[PDB]
């Protein structure tokens, strides 16, 4: 069925879903850092990172844009998802941490 938009208010919260149900985390990035929202850990749960330039010019330096995280309930149980704002080629202690606990039925 249709997915549900997730945001910062869902950070470190628990959401109960049905097995196979999809969710989407929509968070804006920052070209100042060049970092991106990428899931580094999940409890057997599927994750996909898709950049979406929300009213921005993609490929154009100076523009912004958002990163959509597609989450699928692959197995029954509560899974902790670690979503980190960082760059593969630029680490940082001040990387943003976004926690999502998905209770799959």
Curated annotation (Swiss-Prot):
It is found in: Cytoplasm. A motif (FG loop) lies at residues 88-96. The keyword Disulfide bond applies. A motif (DE loop) lies at residues 54-64. Cysteine protease inhibitor. Inhibits cysteine proteases CP1, CP2 and CP5. May protect the cytosol against cysteine proteases released by damaged intracellular vesicles. The BC, DE and FG loops form a tripartite wedge that blocks the substrate-binding site of target cysteine proteases. The BC loop interacts with the catalytically active cysteine and histidine residues of the protease catalytic center. This is Amoebiasin-1. It comes from Entamoeba histolytica (strain ATCC 30459 / HM-1:IMSS / ABRM).
